[PDB]
Amino acid sequence: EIRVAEVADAGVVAKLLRDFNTEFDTPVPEGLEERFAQIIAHDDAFVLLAGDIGFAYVTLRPSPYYDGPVAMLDELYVAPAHRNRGVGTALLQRVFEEIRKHSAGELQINVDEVDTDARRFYERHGLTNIEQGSRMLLYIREL
Amino acid sequence: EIRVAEVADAGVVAKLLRDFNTEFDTPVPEGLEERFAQIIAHDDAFVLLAGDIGFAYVTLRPSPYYDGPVAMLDELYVAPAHRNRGVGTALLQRVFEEIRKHSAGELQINVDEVDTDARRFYERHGLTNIEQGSRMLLYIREL
Ligand SMILES: CC(=O)SCCNC(=O)CCNC(=O)[C@H](O)C(C)(C)COP(=O)(O)OP(=O)(O)OC[C@H]1O[C@@H](n2cnc3c(N)ncnc32)[C@H](O)[C@@H]1OP(=O)(O)O
Ligand SMILES: CC(C)(COP(=O)(O)OP(=O)(O)OC[C@H]1O[C@@H](n2cnc3c(N)ncnc32)[C@H](O)[C@@H]1OP(=O)(O)O)[C@@H](O)C(=O)NCCC(=O)NCCS
Ligand SMILES: CN[C@@H]1[C@@H](O)[C@@H](O[C@@H]2[C@@H](O)[C@H](O[C@H]3OC(CN)=CC[C@H]3N)[C@@H](NC(C)=O)C[C@H]2N)OC[C@]1(C)O
């Protein structure tokens, strides 16, 4: 039931991303569907879909530390009514399986500190916030 | 002046990243020069050089939220003897200038929490760790 999205799946992915943003009261730009179609077709990136009820969006970017890329799980979402039944675990498992085909050297994920359920999920599935004895922070500037 | 690194500059970039790692007692991979030569040749990353004494390494990756990329400042370093004189400020200004040429929608930087002096620098130059009243964290798994 997890599969790799094709270009023609961009509409379902965009709908799920819209739902994710709506759940968190964050507005979305126009054009999500068109942009996902281009990303899936041409870029060093992929989307995994669990039926039409969850997705994972992964980007691959270069690193001097590895022959392969660094992977980033830029979005992971399971629809609220389908949570706590193993869908997110299955998506994350498949993320690790797919990035291994690309010999990715590392997976990175940005998470809000307040999102303790997501944090617990990631910690229980092998991700850490600690490097060289310190927490790792994300700083941004929107442009 | 600050310049965009060419493939011919891979050795200098590799030297600076090795120096950075050595200073912080972090592992140094084999093959840095050859990997930077390949990375610099491609279209989704660049390095800025301040003479031979500082550098910024930036990657670009797709996002459904913008027509342009999300930019990541994966490494920023000024040699110890040249710090506190405005070099890092100049490098970061040029990062913003060059990613604006790419119409990048956002700059992201991962920073260790213990690096309070670096965090002060990023905050003074328009970066934020806060989204909707929460700090943002980075989780990783090395593979
Ligand atoms: C990358 C980003 O976007 S950053 C943050 C990620 N996204 C979000 O936070 C958005 C909102 N949240 C979600 O979409 C979901 O909560 C996710 C994606 C984090 C997790 O998805 P779920 O489908 O709930 O995950 P899953 O069910 O596999 O595991 C969650 C819990 O269910 C329980 N569980 C797991 N598998 C099963 C199962 N097969 N049967 C019964 N219960 C189960 C466990 O108690 C687990 O808890 P843990 O965190 O202590 O391990
Ligand atoms: C962080 C760094 C890139 C900033 O470059 P810089 O040329 O010193 O920056 P500028 O001169 O434009 O601005 C000065 C600020 O740099 C920071 N800074 C200076 N030396 C620093 C050092 N060893 N370590 C960390 N931050 C430092 C301080 O915030 C300083 O501000 P202050 O006058 O209030 O103390 C540079 O200091 C450096 O390479 N430090 C060690 C490696 C590092 O921390 N990289 C950042 C990755 S998170
Ligand atoms: C293992 N995973 C790693 C992953 O966490 C991440 O590390 C970032 C990296 O960008 C960088 O590191 C340097 O700064 C310092 C200061 N302590 C030590 C080592 C330096 N190379 C820092 N940011 C900036 C913008 O310079 C924070 C650091 N946490 O990138 C590399 C990675 C190997 O992939």
A35 inside 8 A of chain B by CB: yes
CA A68 to chain centre: 18
Query: Helices (DSSP H) in chain B: which residue ranges?
Result: 10-24, 32-41, 87-101, 116-124
- So what's the architecture of B2-110 in CATH? 3-Layer(aba) Sandwich (3.40)
Number of Cβ within a 10 Å radius of residue A88 = 21
CA separation (Å) from A58 to A55, A84, A92, A101?
10, 22, 10, 13
Cβ(A109) – ligand 1 distance below 6 Å: yes
Resolution of this entry in Å?
1.5
Q: Domain extents for chain B?
A: 2-110
Angle formed at CA B118 by CA B92 and CA B141, multiple of 5 degrees: 95
Q: Is A4 left (phi over 0), alpha (psi -120 to 50) or beta?
A: beta
Residues from chain B that touch A140, judged by Cβ atoms under 8 A, are: 106-109, 127-128, 131, 136
Q: How far is the CA of B74 from the centre of ligand 3 (A)?
A: 7
Residue A13: enclosing H or E segment and its boundaries?
A: helix A10-23
Chain B 79-98, residues with CB within 8 Å of chain A CB atoms: 96
CATH H superfamily, domain A2-111:
Gcn5-related N-acetyltransferase (GNAT) (3.40.630.30)
Instruction: Give CA–CA dist B73/B58, Å, rounded.
Output: 5
